[PDB]
Amino acid sequence: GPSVFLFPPKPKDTLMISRTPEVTCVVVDVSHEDPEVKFNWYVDGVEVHNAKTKPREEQYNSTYRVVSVLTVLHQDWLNGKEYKCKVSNKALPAPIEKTISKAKGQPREPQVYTLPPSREEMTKNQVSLVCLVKGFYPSDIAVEWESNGQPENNYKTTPPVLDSDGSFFLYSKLTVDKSRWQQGNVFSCSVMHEALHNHYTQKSLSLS
């Protein structure tokens, strides 16, 4: 029978006022004989009516994928409101219900520190500029890098790790040619998190 999977907005979309956060009810294993799906949506128990159904997609295993998308307000999501999707279908003896929301728990401001390459890394062709982000809750976060108004894309960021005080930390490492570092260039770590002033901080880093 059909199965339902419900996904939160992308952290960034909830955090950038200039973007459009949405929750997404994905229904798989829809039979050819009964492709009709009904969606009911609830925000804290109260039914809303403004969802839109995405175009039906045929799956190479003879089933349909049906998706309903609900747009939401930045503050509603960040206030921890609960979003419920309810799926009815003839191949489904009883309606399936799913709920998500932001992780419950007092939000905590991340502390952002940049760390220059080890004196021991200075021998190599490339160097690691590190951004440590610690003391944040919930774990929803965006980390990016830049120099001179342009994104630096050659970085990798760790998954969030639960720390012994109940908050999270991560590290992000950008790899640059040693010369680019020697050349005095200033590099920036951009972090977006709900509990920061204006949901945004930036820490810079250069050879001294």
Binding site: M16, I17, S18, S190, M192, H197, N198, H199, Y200
Partner: peptide, 13 residues
């Protein structure tokens, strides 16, 4: 005040 990210508006209090 307002924060921006690569020219794009993040948030204003």
């Amino acid at each position: 005040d307002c924060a921006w990210h690569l020219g794009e508006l993040v948030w204003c209090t």
